Amino acid sequence: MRLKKLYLKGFKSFGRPSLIGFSDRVTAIVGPNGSGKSNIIDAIKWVFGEKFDMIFAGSENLPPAGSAYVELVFEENGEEITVARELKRTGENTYYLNGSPVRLKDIRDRFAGTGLGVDFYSIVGQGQIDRIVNAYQRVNESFNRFISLLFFGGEGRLEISIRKPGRRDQKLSLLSGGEKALVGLALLFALMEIKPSPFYVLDEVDSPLDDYNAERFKRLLKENSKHTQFIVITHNKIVMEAADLLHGVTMVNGVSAIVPVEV
Numbered sequence: 001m002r003l004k005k006l007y008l009k010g011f012k013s014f015g016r017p018s019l020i021g022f023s024d025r026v027t028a029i030v031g032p033n034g035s036g037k038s039n040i041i042d043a044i045k046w047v048f049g050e051k052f053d054m055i056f057a058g059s060e061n062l063p064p065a066g067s068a069y070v071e072l073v074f075e076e077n078g079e080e081i082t083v084a085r086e087l088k089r090t091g092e093n094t095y096y097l098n099g100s101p102v103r104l105k106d107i108r109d110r111f112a113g114t115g116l117g118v119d120f121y122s123i124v125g126q127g128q129i130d131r132i133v134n135a136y137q138r139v140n141e142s143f144n145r146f147i148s149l150l151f152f153g154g155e156g157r158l159e160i161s162i163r164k165p166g167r168r169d170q171k172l173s174l175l176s177g178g179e180k181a182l183v184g185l186a187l188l189f190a191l192m193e194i195k196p197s198p199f200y201v202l203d204e205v206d207s208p209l210d211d212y213n214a215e216r217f218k219r220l221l222k223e224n225s226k227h228t229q230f231i232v233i234t235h236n237k238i239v240m241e242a243a244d245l246l247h248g249v250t251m252v253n254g255v256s257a258i259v260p261v262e263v
Contacts, residue, residue, distance in 0.1 A: 001081075001198040002229055005073040010065030011046070012039045015056045015255040020247060022199075025225035028243035029233040035256050037233060037249040041123060041201055043070045047085045048107060048117045055089060059253045064089075074198060083107055114197045121195050124188060125203040132191070133160075133172075133184040143190035149223060150182055150216050160187070181208040182216055189224050199229045206236045214238035 003022050008014040013035065020040070031037045046054070047070040056065035071084035084096040095104050108117035115121035140158045147156030153165035160172040162183055172180060185205060192200065209217055214236055221230065221242045232239060240246060240263055248261040 001074050001076050003072060003199045003231070004075050004080075005071075006040065006043065007069075007071040007073075007084075008040075008043055009069045010056045011043050011068040011070050012054060012056070013251055013254065013256040014039065014043075015059050015062050015065065016257070018256075018258050020258050021245065021260070022229070022231065023243070023245035024229055026221060026230050026232060026243045027245045027247070028240050029231065029247050029249065029258075030235060030240060030261075031249035034251045035249045037256075038203075039256065040249070040258075041203065041231075041233070044072065044201075045120060045123065046070055047072055047083055048111075048120075049104070050120065052087075052089060054087060057254065059255050061253075062255065081110065083110075115195070116197070122197040122199060123201045123203065124205070126205055126207060129181070129184045129188060129205055132187060133180070136194075138193045139190050142193055143187060146186040146189055146220060146223075147183065149220060150186060156183070156186065158187075178208050178210050178213040182213055182220075185217060186220065189220065192224075192228060197228075199231055202230055202232045202234075204234060206234050206239050209236070209239075211238060218242045 002024055005022070006020040008018040029037055029040060055068045058064040067086055067088040069086045071082065074081040082098050085094070087093045095102055095107055097106055097110060111117055115123070143158055144156045147162055148154055151164050155163045160183065161169055162172060162175060163169045172183060175183070206214060206217060215238055218238055218241055224230070232243065234240065246261055246263060247258050249256055249258050
């Protein structure tokens with residue numbers, strides 16, 4: 001199952017009707033701090049679980065919106081699953097599933113083994129990365145494969161141990177700063193073995209990564225993107241390389257806009 005389309009209209013900074021498409025692999029959302037484009041991830045959480053300050057306030061030539069409307073379109077086996085939510089200024093909130101008004105619980109149920117609805121483990125930020133590094137055989141085994149891919153040969157053990165190719169065993173403790181970041185990402189990817197989900201969102205997880213390490217994160221991302229799809233929001237030019245579809249966001253008045261651009 002994959003996320004195929006996102007539709008905004010009256011949600012937070014998106015005053016005008018927006019429509020985003022997603023790659024089966026890596027999709028990158030780029031843009032200035034003007035939008036600090038988090039609003040797109042917020043919309044995703046909003047349409048599920050996570051006063052009217054959620055509805056468009058008005059523009060230099062757009063009246064406040066009568067409501068906030070968000071819609072997601074997934075695809076199963078050549079099938080389409082549509083989830084939507086509409087909060088009116090009147091107060092009337094309502095969920096939809098394939099064109100039919102429905103209870104929120106019904107949406108959650110339709111997306112069982114996914115973070116969607118409950119805790120959202122699919123949406124990961126720099127925070128969760130750190131809290132996972134400072135907190136089965138399939139996982140320990142995957143963690144190893146990824147560490148080798150990262151350094152072209154070593155080993156990884158799960159306390160974390162990282163042994164580089166021509167070297168000897170080592171404790172995560174005395175490892176580089178940017179390198180620790182890498183292995184952290186490697187752990188997150190490994191844990192996806194017991195944390196399945198259609199897509200994963202990586203929210204600015206390349207800060208500590210310099211150009212060299214970034215190139216490694218890029219090689220890792222492309223390996224995982226083969227069986228899981230990622231929505232990466234970064235402003236790092238190296239990471240954007242792994243993207244198969246790029247989207248740029250800009251806010252002119254109080255209105256934002258998304259337009260697939262080209263690297």
